[PDB]
Design a protein that fits this description.
Largest interface: A-B, 14 and 16 residues
PDB class: transport protein
Largest sheet of chain A: none
Order of helices and strands of chain A: H
Structural class of chain A: mainly alpha
Oligomer: part of a larger assembly
Shape of chain A: rod-shaped
Radius of gyration of chain A: 15 Å
Protein name (chains A, B): Transient receptor potential cation channel subfamily M member 8
Subcellular location (chains A, B): Cell membrane; Membrane raft
Subunit structure (chains A, B): Homotetramer. Interacts (via N-terminus and C-terminus domains) with TCAF1; the interaction stimulates TRPM8 channel activity. Interacts (via N-terminus and C-terminus domains) with TCAF2; the interaction inhibits TRPM8 channel activity.
Family (chains A, B): Belongs to the transient receptor (TC 1.A.4) family. LTrpC subfamily. TRPM8 sub-subfamily.
Strand content of chain A: under 5%
């Protein structure tokens, strides 16, 4: 059983998780500046 | 041997590398403003 969907899938997970904590940092800046 | 997984894969790499140095620039702004 050989699969490459898990590889690109976890690439998608790590990519949008980095987008998630970038969103958290942008909300943190939006709170701390105001 | 024909493969298109390398093409979309390196699209994923260039896309999340641009997200990486965007993350670096956002951390740079978060450090320099405070």
């Amino acid at each position: 059983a050989n699969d490459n969907s898990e590889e690109m899938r976890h690439r998608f997970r790590q990519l949008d998780s980095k987008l998630n904590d970038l969103k958290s940092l942008l909300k943190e800046i939006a709170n701390n500046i105001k």
